[PDB]
């Protein structure tokens, strides 16, 4: 009666859950909506993300993570349980082997609490791994080889960079300059340069639709809808990709600096691997147009943009199944 393997990518922006024999059962926003002042969940995932900034007084929004850190442990615990309910499997936790991948900013205290909760739910084994380690494996690097894997993971709450070798993280660092920061800067820029008020939904759509870090073959622009800063009256304006590219390049100076900082702290034998083989890039922001060109021009090493940039962590978790199963056989 093989034990069920359950894997959870717990992320600031999105979370993914996988159950062996079922595949991915959840791949949606890390957001919940409750009837205000009650325990009644009214939305989870994408339906809850849509409610952000669009609620009335009797709906409120909770997010288990903010900038890679747990906001409220009970909220995080309930979120995990609601994710598991999406499986439609009775007693899904019972006798299960659970792998949770989470940001480094989740404390050991919070990790142990998640372990104990899943154990309370029926799990026979619970292990917690750093998202950066799983991302590199899922994005295709042999993290187990004695060889330096150079990873950059640009998410919503955090950007992390590190060197991986021989099954573990050798050195790493995370910064707050990531997707959420970028979209807030676009919002601020639009107000400052176009004297128009927009929200974060529009700023993110600008970033996804016309954002770039290098001039592409295609010139793009956008019409956006907002309110005049002066009159509060309805207003629409055109945003050019060139003005957003200038902004993104300036913002990404902190991200190139992070990559340089990792290299400067890389042990010398591993640094030759990082330089010769180059950078592996994952996370949702790895999809920004021209990122590869931007990084290759600056660093003059190969840059691989993961083809699975948002499922890299869960895919690593799935690849890590034998390793987690061997930890249970051996704990006997
Ligand atoms: N096509 C896209 N182009 C650009 N950015 C995108 C795209 N799709 C998603 N994003 C951004 O990717 C970010 C989320 O990446 P993702 O790896 O799913 O985050 P996460 O793992 O939940 N957050 P974190 O805990 O910081 O790693 C958000 O800032 C999105 O706006
Ligand atoms: Mg992530």
Residue numbers in the entry: 17 to 348
Question: What wording appears in the published article?
Answer:
MreB is a bacterial protein belonging to the actin superfamily. This protein polymerizes into an antiparallel double-stranded filament that determines cell shape by maintaining cell wall synthesis. Here, we studied MreB3 and MreB5 in Spiroplasma eriocheiris (SpeMreB3 and SpeMreB5, respectively), a model organism for studying Spiroplasma swimming. SpeMreB3 adopts a canonical actin fold composed of four subdomains (IA, IB, IIA and IIB) and consists of the same secondary structure elements as CcMreB, Thermotoga maritima (Tm) MreB and SciMreB5, except for the C-terminal region.
The crystal structures of nucleotide-free (Nf) SpeMreB3 and its AMPPNP complex were determined at 1.90 and 1.75 Å resolution. The SpeMreB3-AMPPNP complex crystal includes two molecules (Mol-A and Mol-B) with an RMSD value estimated for Cα atoms of 0.891 Å. Thus, the SpeMreB3-AMPPNP complex crystal also contains antiparallel pairs of the protofilaments, although their arrangement differs from that of the Nf-SpeMreB3 crystal. The angle composed of centroids of subdomains IIB-IIA-IA (ω2) was more constant than ω1 among our crystal structures (ω2 = 88.9° for SpeMreB3-AMPPNP complex Mol-A, 90.3° for Mol-B and 91.2° for Nf-SpeMreB3), indicating that major structural changes upon nucleotide binding contribute to swing the subdomain IB. These conformational changes lead to the interaction between subdomains IIA and IB', which are absent in the Nf-SpeMreB3 protofilament. The interaction in SpeMreB3-AMPPNP complex Mol-A is mediated through a hydrogen-bonding network and is stabilized by an electrostatic interaction between D289 and K70’. The protofilament model of the SpeMreB3-AMPPNP complex fits well with the protofilament image in an antiparallel manner, suggesting that the protofilament structure in the double-stranded filament is the same as that in the crystal. In the SpeMreB3 structure, D147 and K174 are located at positions corresponding to E140 and T167 in CcMreB, respectively. However, D147 is far from the putative nucleophilic water molecule and K174 does not interact with water molecules. The residue corresponding to E169 is replaced by serine (S176) in SpeMreB3, which does not interact with K174.
